[PDB]
Design a protein around this ligand. Structure first.
Ligand SMILES: Nc1ncnc2c1ncn2[C@@H]1O[C@H](CO)[C@H](O)[C@H]1O
Ligand SMILES: Nc1ncnc2c1ncn2[C@@H]1O[C@H](CO)[C@H](O)[C@H]1O
Lengths: 246, 242
């Protein structure tokens, strides 16, 4: 009875799945997230349905922001919740680290300068987006390469908002970034300020060194990037300043 | 150190999965990493805890064809790494958008090729799950996203974080039934998989398990699936309903 044709199974995790579909009335591309309840223990945490409704709430707080997927529809069949979101076209930032990173040992500085400009675009777009989210009273809590969409026109977007929370809440909980240890004792907009600094270095470091080097090496990492990329040098300095503020 | 990360595959609950190559032997490997306190869940488990648990399950299942081997595991500071063998092939869920939508006024030869293919894949999933139970552990996340179809059409399973000993839930297509335990949890998932291989995606998500017999009827009208196959699935899925 649905007006949506589900055409692809993208992901499933913890009672929640993500599918690509089609509005049959308009042909419009959509994304479907759905959740099923789990009667369980408190130690089990929030179930898929509870986390689905929080994400919908957060996306409704952020409606109208360019870079935040719109909520098109929501319904329940029995206790099966469905959340219909607009589909952000483009590629996630983590898929650029496959090819666009091996900037080989000795490459053409034409491509080096082009990449530095490109990376600074992406961080600036992600920062503007994060700023607009803070203006609604929301702190994204999960900023990293796997959540950042790079659209065909080079503008950016963020995919998963299940981890976002109101800014007024004061929570010592810090989610870790793929590259550096979670910073001890941070809340409010400072959590995103930290992830953005991590992203400023990650955009230039090769994947292997990303996972291996810890946050005490940030100063070394900034100086190393400066010698190999034409970055305005205080830009990298300020990232290492933010990552090592404790 | 002895690995070169080539691609960033996924990051969830403070844990990253990366594709890599052993710099010595040149072999393809999968890198999983976790930092302490990261991904702290309501039950006190962090990403290191889950990674330690996944290695334990993989070690108890060593030697089973279809369970990725544990190649390496080490720490770099407080940073834990788990190096697994790369399963070649495609995840079963990527076929559900490519192989079986065109089989809507369809070509009967292709309908038959797909049917024999799906019964082979499901039978291989059955044997893998049987060998795993024999080793005393129950898979818990058996569904199309966890099954790899290798080049030779043999199957493997991919994520063993959810695995647990038989001593001590929801499926993409249907709700988990109340109070099933032991190896019976895995056989419910296998039953759901039987109908899932033959249903269109929208009917999978929309139809609940009260309609199992109806969906089994619908499947036999499009596919040459033996009826006992579909009825064992419908019966197992409804075994505790009015
Ligand atoms: N609202 C949305 N628009 C486009 N893609 C979405 C999406 N929500 C999830 N995805 C897809 O999930 C994967 C990353 O979690 C994929 O990287 C990502 O494509
Ligand atoms: N040993 C392995 N061989 C191939 N792919 C692996 C893998 N381990 C994990 N993946 C891929 O990572 C994602 C989530 O773990 C995907 O679920 C999964 O495709």
């Amino acid at each position: 009875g649905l007006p949506y044709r589900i055409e692809a199974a993208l992901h499933f995790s913890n009672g929640g799945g993500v599918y690509a579909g089609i509005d049959t009335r308009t042909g419009a591309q959509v994304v479907l997230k759905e959740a099923r309840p789990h009667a369980g223990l408190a130690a089990d945490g929030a179930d898929a349905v509870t986390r689905l409704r929080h994400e919908r709430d957060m996306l409704q707080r952020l409606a109208g922001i360019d870079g935040v997927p719109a909520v098109l529809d929501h319904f329940t069949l029995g206790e099966h919740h469905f959340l219909v979101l607009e589909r952000i076209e483009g590629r996630a930032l983590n898929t650029f680290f496959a090819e666009r990173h091996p900037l080989d040992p000795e490459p053409d500085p034409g491509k080096i300068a082009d990449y530095t400009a490109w990376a600074l675009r992406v961080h600036a777009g992600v920062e503007r987006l994060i700023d607009a989210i803070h203006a609604r009273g929301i702190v994204y809590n999960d900023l990293h390469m796997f959540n950042i969409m790079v659209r065909p026109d080079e503008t950016v977007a963020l995919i998963d908002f299940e981890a976002a929370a109101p800014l007024a809440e004061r929570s010592r909980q810090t989610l870790a970034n793929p590259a550096f240890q979670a910073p001890p004792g941070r809340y409010g907009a400072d959590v995103d300020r930290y992830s953005l600094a991590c992203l400023r270095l990650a955009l230039f470091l090769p994947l292997t060194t990303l996972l291996v080097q810890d946050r005490h090496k940030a100063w070394e990492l900034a100086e190393a990037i400066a010698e190999h990329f034409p970055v305005p040098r205080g830009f990298l300095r300020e990232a290492a300043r933010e990552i090592t503020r404790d």
